[PDB]
Amino acid sequence: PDKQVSKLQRKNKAKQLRAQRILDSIENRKLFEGKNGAAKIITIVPLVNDLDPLDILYKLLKCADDEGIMVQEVDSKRIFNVHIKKFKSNLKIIIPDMTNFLNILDCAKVADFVVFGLSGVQEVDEEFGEQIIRALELQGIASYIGVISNLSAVHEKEKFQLDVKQSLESYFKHFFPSEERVYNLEKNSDALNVLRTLCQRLPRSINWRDNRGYVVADFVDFVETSPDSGDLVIEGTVRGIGFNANRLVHIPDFGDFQLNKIEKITVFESNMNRDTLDEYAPEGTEDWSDYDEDFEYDGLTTARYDDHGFLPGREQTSKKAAVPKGTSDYQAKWYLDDVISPEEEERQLREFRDMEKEDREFPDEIELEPSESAIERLKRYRGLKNLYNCDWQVDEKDPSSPAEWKRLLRIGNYKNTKNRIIKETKNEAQAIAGDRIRMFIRFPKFLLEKIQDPKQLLFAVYGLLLHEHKNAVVNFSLQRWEQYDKPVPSQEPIVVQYGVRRYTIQPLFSQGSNSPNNVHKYERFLHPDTVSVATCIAPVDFTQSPAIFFKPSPTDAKNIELIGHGTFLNADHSRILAKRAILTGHPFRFHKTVVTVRYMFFRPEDVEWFKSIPLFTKSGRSGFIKESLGTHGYFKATFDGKLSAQDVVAMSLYKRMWPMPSLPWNG
RNA sequence: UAUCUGGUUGAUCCUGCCAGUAGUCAUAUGCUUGUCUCAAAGAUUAAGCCAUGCAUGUCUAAGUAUAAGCAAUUUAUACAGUGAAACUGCGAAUGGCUCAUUAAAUCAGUUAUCGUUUAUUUGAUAGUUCCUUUACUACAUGGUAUAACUGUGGUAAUUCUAGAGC
RNA sequence: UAGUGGCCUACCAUGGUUUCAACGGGUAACGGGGAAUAAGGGUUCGAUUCCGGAGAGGGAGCCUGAGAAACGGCUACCACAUC
RNA sequence: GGUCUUGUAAUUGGAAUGAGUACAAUGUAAAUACCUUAACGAGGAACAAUUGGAGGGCAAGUCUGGUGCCAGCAGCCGCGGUAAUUCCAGCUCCAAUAGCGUAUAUUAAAGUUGUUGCAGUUAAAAAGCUCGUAGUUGAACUUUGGGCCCGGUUGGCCGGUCGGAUUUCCAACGGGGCCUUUCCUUCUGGCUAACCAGGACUUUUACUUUGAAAAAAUUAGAGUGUUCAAAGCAGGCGUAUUGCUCGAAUAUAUUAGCAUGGAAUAAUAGAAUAGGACGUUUGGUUCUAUUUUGUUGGUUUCUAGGACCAUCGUAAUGAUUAAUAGGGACGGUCGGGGGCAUCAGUAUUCAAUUGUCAGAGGUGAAAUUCUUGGAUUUAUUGAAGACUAACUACUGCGAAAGCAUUUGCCAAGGACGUUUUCAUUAAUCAAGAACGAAAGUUAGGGGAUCGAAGAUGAUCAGAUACCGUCGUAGUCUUAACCAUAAACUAUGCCGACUAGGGAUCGGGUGGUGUUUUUUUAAUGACCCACUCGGCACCUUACGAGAAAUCAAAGUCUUUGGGUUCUGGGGGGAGUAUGGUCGCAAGGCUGAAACUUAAAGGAAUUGACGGAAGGGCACCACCAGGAGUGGAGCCUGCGGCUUAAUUUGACUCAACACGGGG
RNA sequence: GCCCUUUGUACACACCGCCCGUCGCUAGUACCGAUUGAAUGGCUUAGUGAGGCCUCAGGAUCUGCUUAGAGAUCUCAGAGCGGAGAAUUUGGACAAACUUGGUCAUUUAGAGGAACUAAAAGUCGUAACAAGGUUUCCGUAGGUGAACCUGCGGAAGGAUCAUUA
């Protein structure tokens, strides 16, 4: 009735809205504050091979003076549940050795608090230290609270000595600047400021890290529950986004498996409504029957340019014999018409990095020697008009389709199923994270080489989803790694991480421009600056991580050869390709209307039958071939202006190659 | 130091808005950052919530010493120089912070108290006190009550305190 | 009451304020010198080192005392919240 | 010939230094630093100043590459479609400089808040017109001119001081003592009015002038070498011989409050009864004790100090005006002014009689109706309404809406004349109240006229749907509303003046003034003059306005005669919402959310026409000739076919084939 | 047909229905909210009202003076009276607060409606089909696919050369 929203001195009654803000500051104090399933992973990895965190646990905590001193033990615990008697919390500090580079980047999904070890003794190395900066950094640092752990650096000068601290406080801020000062080991309350940082200072969050169900791997077992399965008694402080009884369990480096009964020490089984233990979709073989494009390659008259162009020129072959002797180009048809390895990194490094321009400028040029044939090589695919305007498709019916392309979970869209896939975990989230859990995880006897008991070593365990058991086809966004100048050809197996886990996938990089129509290329090779878009089949981990593509070798002081970082863009079937061609025209003279071009067509059936190709200049002057006669190849057309011997009278082969699957590398 | 400029029309003669510009003991903030003297600095936005430590206690010739406490006894058997604790007195109503309230309220300038209280400070001020000073008197000075001292204890824990003897 | 007084209280009178704006409402309102100004006037701000007022999270209430409706004083309620 | 320089000069040339490290001690409660201080650390690679721009506002290239709508660039406009000054870069340059940007907020320019100091004819804005209260203002009058001197200040011929007035001649700026009715008072001890007590003022508020209160800190400024400063109120000087000694101003802060003149302005009015002042007067009323009485209290007077009746002696005994401001009376006019009856008109259509004997009706073509039981052009009598047609305008009036023929009736008004009466009774206007076109709203009268809607005929495509015919209500009135107009002269109402005019109409006057005839200028009307009322016009525009135009849309930047209501860019929007007034329809008051670089005013210059004139052309037309138009081929191409069956623009095209048979 | 051109006089580009509109979908947000949860309160209706302070009282107790029970400054019942005086209870007024009614609400959580918004995409009508109005108003009354039209009043914000004694 009355629009009477005035008299708002009881706008102060709407400090009720601050009460919601009070409610905003209550339910987030549920999972992180206590002892019963509230102890946090803090992994201390210095940037320096010295500083050796047995004194960082001890000589730093000589100001705390509770008995984390007493268990600061040569029997390296790594589950340090010392209840420190002033801020009331059990703890966990992972102290890894400096070399085991395989889980430091992998255990960091539960690991909230990350602490660099900063030293002016060793210069932070451009392959060890600065690249551990780039490795811990570009996975997404959950919380970076820097500590100068230097005991032997407080007397390297006596004459305003504080440059040993300023050079490190700025070095925390040259890449990851969210600390102001970095603390000396000579003030008192800075050691229980660590426990303030654990208890009262809540950590901040990574986008991709906190989207799933992720668990802790304290201990495992060797059980016999099948001819080839067992069980796992895992102590795990779960911090996931909300588990479900429908979910599956994930042993990284080995496989994808299933439980027996989810319990607490309330029984939740591995119930019937599940995807049975496939990897490619089992309905995919039957999905190799949606004959969307039966584009038979040699049983046509016209390419798919119907959709305003050609009336088709029919060549109805009705040959008649040529009886008398001696024949030129002309007289045959009017004879008797009864009309009724480091060396090849210098040998083949000449070409296998400089053939990267064979992709760019002459992609599918039919190249022309008098021995090379024009018909056979680039034969068996369409030739539409323009990549920003044409029409290429998803699922033809050919043998060119690989194994987990025609046996796919054909991913609909990524963006229109990320709401499904994530909201399968948003809504169907039943088993409560935050607690402790004793689960009978069925554990196969096959994969019992490298599953260990980490009180001193490094391993972790992850979770799965319902339809993450199925797999799909991905299309990455990649940038070149910084200060990594040398290119790599892009039809080659690169070990893809999108996140942390490793797969030697065989991608297809294409240009990462702003694409209106979402139509791509089969670009063979790379570009040294801009964004690349990979295209491959991967067995899919659907949470948009900063992707790391590398070479599987312990080459540098890093145990990786970092090739390039980028973005897990999507997993999409209709994100489709079209490889270009640019043919050649070299104008032999300087004409007015009809330009006599040579160096264009050698053979007569390569002259005559290849007169159905659209003539376009490199300047873009499109058009069609009306005639041609050249042998050592002319034409006769009509363009905007005139032509010159440095022009390119190009022609169109717009062809479509087909993608390549992955390889799971773990070693 | 009483400056204005660009935008409607094809244009001689021609109105009202917008944008630019300059200050800010206005804030915030980007980039850069070497000296000298300075120097604000948790108001808004939460008159919202707090670990921890500190911020108010105090004694001189001149209120109460048997510390068993000590220094030298050296000037003394009544005491006498120092002096813990404790009684007593004064202080703790000043300072410091914050600005939510509050619109004839506060406050500001001017009034008034012939209508009122005032530790302190400063100045002045009790022959009549046995109310019979015709006395049951001790004014050569009359009584209790107690802390600390002590020595037996309980409390999960508080600057909790109990029982007796001084 | 320290004291004037509708400050109450007991009987009386029917008054008092106002379009010279009563009363009611809002204030991102603590009031006074300051600031940005700069032909002059006008404009907007003033939590803030000084003066005065108010409060010790919000309302009550009382002791000691010359002085407090005191909170690094006390009792109770209300909102919190420690071992 | 280079004494001197502008830079090219990277060839120089040694000397020279701080930020930074340091003994040293000061420095400080203890330390840092900072004035101090020896040792050590510079050459351009040194020990290197960044930040924003580079199309206009807005300095600074149309330099060169990649870029040619592809991004770009844009606070507002403006470019790039390929000659980009405006794109990515390379240069290079421009500013401010350990400092430059950016975001919002305010101030300024911003006469876009206007008291100073806007704007309403058309650009947003004057309302429908009167009556009216609060408020805001409000007509004119009250002691001039001159003498006696005092000389505070200046002119300088004086110069006697040689930057200055002291003997001082000529005039000039000031207030006082006093005076030409200029009362400037009375009241007397100090007293013989200089000034101090004493009784009244030639009235009280509004106004203003000088004090006082206005905390210190801020704002303005001596002085001070804190090294200048920002600061700070500090400090300076010798024989340092044992000390000497300057300071730490003032300016400011209205109302309100408290003291005194000033003598206008506005206010308030005396003395219209003269029951009043000058009453220095007299019986009588309230009186009376500082008293003297005799020391102190019941009983008294004369008596110091006020008032009036009986009562009259006193000087000059009280009526500021009749307004080119209003209100009355009375007078002749005036009168399509308004109102109440009567009343006439050309006739109108409707109704009848009567006369009649086969078409009219519209529109651009057409389509809708009456009648041999009588059409329509004839002849005669009524109901209703309308308006008084022409005379009807350089009109006359009325608050506005409005009103045009007579006669009687009813007041007022307007004008004009007056040597009549009120003597400021006054202007507008919050609130409040009358009236109110057309239309519309309830209850009635007629029901003649046409006629929003509607019922019919239309009638062909949208030459365009303008046509035509009947029509409830309505138009006309009665008892009442409504409260709307381009209700507009697009201009609120009372003031001031100016132009310049020939007429008007309402009044007033009569020329040795001209004619019918009261008898040269009578009834009436005139030429020449003159006055105030209403309606108008056009000039040069002095003044404006931006401009059309305006004698007021003036006397406004040379800004203020009084008062009332509106407007702040366009929209959104007179929309929502709420408060009202009505039975209603609607009327009165009135936003935001959002979006914009515009909306708007008057004014002008000449392309294109679906405007065509004349020419004048037989490279076009009529009279026909030659003759195509049906065909074989030279001569010349577009089409098939090619290793080859080549090729293109000028009078510019359907052509020359480019001497190419 | 074009020259001398005249002249409507820019159309200074004279105004309007009039052309990316329907069905079935993609998402984004206006809004209301027929509905219960709040969330705490303005206002006030009602029954309770902690608490200290003052009073009507009460009197654990310890005491003392004096007459006191017993020995030359003696307690073994005291007895009046006096002093201080810790519980409980009367009343008072001050009174934070509970138990409540409607109401105004807000920020809100479901709950359901009509919608609009984008280059929005298959769609046949006005994409993909062609013309027509070409006095402008104001008040007011009516019809309206539309500027327009009609009724009564009004206006110019509209284009007057000539004959006159």
Residue-wise DSSP of A332-401: GGGSS------SHHHHTTTTTTTTTHHHHTSSS-----SSS-SSSSS------S-TTT----S-B-STTS
SS (H, E, C) A92-119: CEECCCCCCCCCCCCCCCCCCEEEEECC
Cβ–Cβ < 8 Å for A639, A623: yes
Q: What are phi and psi for residue A211, nearest 5 degrees?
A: -120, -5
Cβ–Cβ < 8 Å for A253, A103: no
Q: Please, what's the largest Cα pairwise distance for chain A?
A: 114
State how far the Cα of A527 lies from the Cα of A562, in Å rounded to an integer.
17
Proximity of residue A7 CB to strand C below 7 A: yes
Which 12-41 residues of chain A approach strand B with CB closer than 7 Å? Answer: 18, 21, 25
Buried-exposed string A90-106: b where 16+ CB fall within 10 A, e elsewhere: bbbbbbbebeebbbbbb
Write the single-letter amino acid at A503: Y
Closest to A474 (Cα-Cα) out of A498, A500, A442, A444: A498
Breaks in chain A (C–N > 2.5 Å) following residue: 265, 277, 307, 340, 381, 411, 539, 632
Q: Which nucleotides of B are covered by protein (CB under 7 A)?
A: 46
Proximity of residue A174 CB to strand E below 7 A: no
Closest to A149 (Cα-Cα) out of A167, A133, A165: A165
Region for A544 from its dihedrals, namely left if φ exceeds 0, alpha if ψ lies in -120 to 50, beta otherwise:
left
State how far the Cα of A460 lies from the Cα of A634, in Å rounded to an integer.
68
The token pair that represents A213 in the structure block: 């169900």
Give the bridge partners for A267, in sequence order: none
State how far the Cα of A242 lies from the Cα of A432, in Å rounded to an integer.
6
**Cα–chain-centroid distance for residue A317?**
52
State how far the Cα of A75 lies from the Cα of A505, in Å rounded to an integer.
41
Closest to A424 (Cα-Cα) out of A616, A279, A213: A213
List the helix and strand counts (H, then E) for chain A.
Answer: 8, 22
Proximity of residue A626 CB to strand C below 7 A: no
Which one-letter DSSP state was computed for residue A168?
H
Residue-wise DSSP of A226-251: SSS--------B---S-B-TT--EEE
In angstroms, how far is D426 C1' from A188 CA? 96
Closest to A595 (Cα-Cα) out of A639, A650, A646: A639
Cβ–Cβ < 8 Å for A287, A410: yes
Cβ–Cβ < 8 Å for A462, A214: yes
State how far the Cα of A401 lies from the Cα of A233, in Å rounded to an integer.
43
CB atoms within 10 A of CB A604: 10
Proximity of residue A9 CB to strand C below 7 A: yes
Nucleotide nearest to A333 (CA to C1'): D641
Give the bridge partners for A598, in sequence order: A586
Cα angle, residue A220 at apex, residues A441 and A244 outer, rounded to 5°: 30
Give Cα separations from A621 to A203, A600, A614, A650, A654 (angstroms).
60, 18, 10, 10, 18
Q: Rg of chain A over CA atoms, in angstroms?
A: 33
DSSP H/E element including A505: strand A503-505
Dihedral of the alpha carbons of A545, A550, A556, A557, in degrees to the nearest 10: 30
Proximity of residue A17 CB to strand E below 7 A: yes
Q: Name the experiment that determined this structure.
A: cryo-EM
**Sign of torsion over alpha carbons A647, A653, A654, A660:** negative
Hunting for tokens 């063979």 — which residue is that? A524
Nucleotide nearest to A15 (CA to C1'): E107
Beta strands across the sheet bearing A462-463: A255-257, A249-251, A462-463
**Cα–chain-centroid distance for residue A536?**
10
Write the single-letter amino acid at A44: I
State how far the Cα of A565 lies from the Cα of A561, in Å rounded to an integer.
12
The token pair that represents A410 in the structure block: 């054909």
**Cα–chain-centroid distance for residue A288?**
27
Report the SS3 class of residue A24: helix
Write the single-letter amino acid at A223: V
**Cα–chain-centroid distance for residue A360?**
23
Tell me the HSE value of A297 on the side-chain side, using a 13 A CA sphere. Answer: 11
- CB-based burial label for A646 (10 Å; 0-12, 13-18, 19+): exposed
CB atoms within 10 A of CB A530: 11
Cβ–Cβ < 8 Å for A367, A355: no
Give the bridge partners for A42, in sequence order: A93, A113
For chain A, the first-to-last Cα distance in angstroms comes to: 73
State how far the Cα of A543 lies from the Cα of A551, in Å rounded to an integer.
23
What stretches of A490-611 show up as alpha helix (H) in DSSP? Answer: 604-608
Residues written for chain A: 667
State how far the Cα of A247 lies from the Cα of A465, in Å rounded to an integer.
5
Q: What are phi and psi for residue A167, nearest 5 degrees?
A: -65, -20
Hunting for tokens 């090849």 — which residue is that? A344
Cβ–Cβ < 8 Å for A193, A183: yes
Proximity of residue A188 CB to strand B below 7 A: no
Non-local CB neighbours of A257 within 8 Å, separated by 6+ positions: A248, A249, A250, A251, A277, A441, A442, A443, A444
State how far the Cα of A320 lies from the Cα of A108, in Å rounded to an integer.
78
State how far the Cα of A136 lies from the Cα of A629, in Å rounded to an integer.
65
Beta strands across the sheet bearing A259-263: A268-269, A259-263, A438-441
Closest to A480 (Cα-Cα) out of A454, A503, A512: A512
State how far the Cα of A628 lies from the Cα of A609, in Å rounded to an integer.
11
Q: Which nucleotides of C are covered by protein (CB under 7 A)?
A: 25-28
In angstroms, how far is D247 C1' from A660 CA? 98
In angstroms, how far is B57 C1' from A187 CA? 34
Cβ–Cβ < 8 Å for A505, A563: no
State how far the Cα of A492 lies from the Cα of A527, in Å rounded to an integer.
15
Which one-letter DSSP state was computed for residue A217?
-
State how far the Cα of A402 lies from the Cα of A408, in Å rounded to an integer.
10
Q: Which nucleotides of D are covered by protein (CB under 7 A)?
A: 20-22, 577-578, 642-644, 647-648
Which one-letter DSSP state was computed for residue A431?
B
Which one-letter DSSP state was computed for residue A420?
H
State how far the Cα of A513 lies from the Cα of A565, in Å rounded to an integer.
17
- CB-based burial label for A371 (10 Å; 0-12, 13-18, 19+): exposed
Q: What are phi and psi for residue A419, nearest 5 degrees?
A: -70, -35
Non-local CB neighbours of A584 within 8 Å, separated by 6+ positions: A362, A365, A368, A599, A600, A648, A649, A650
Q: What are phi and psi for residue A441, nearest 5 degrees?
A: -80, 115
Which one-letter DSSP state was computed for residue A567?
E
Cβ–Cβ < 8 Å for A563, A551: yes
Non-local CB neighbours of A442 within 8 Å, separated by 6+ positions: A225, A226, A229, A230, A231, A257, A258, A259, A260
Report the relative pairing of strands A503-505 and A462-463 from DSSP bridges: unpaired
Residue-wise DSSP of A30-50: SSSSSSTT----EEEEESSS-
In angstroms, how far is C48 C1' from A190 CA? 35
Non-local CB neighbours of A337 within 8 Å, separated by 6+ positions: A320
Cβ–Cβ < 8 Å for A136, A104: yes
Non-local CB neighbours of A551 within 8 Å, separated by 6+ positions: A494, A495, A560, A561, A563
State how far the Cα of A132 lies from the Cα of A56, in Å rounded to an integer.
19
Which one-letter DSSP state was computed for residue A475?
E
State how far the Cα of A661 lies from the Cα of A12, in Å rounded to an integer.
63
The token pair that represents A287 in the structure block: 């999905």
Cβ–Cβ < 8 Å for A527, A541: no
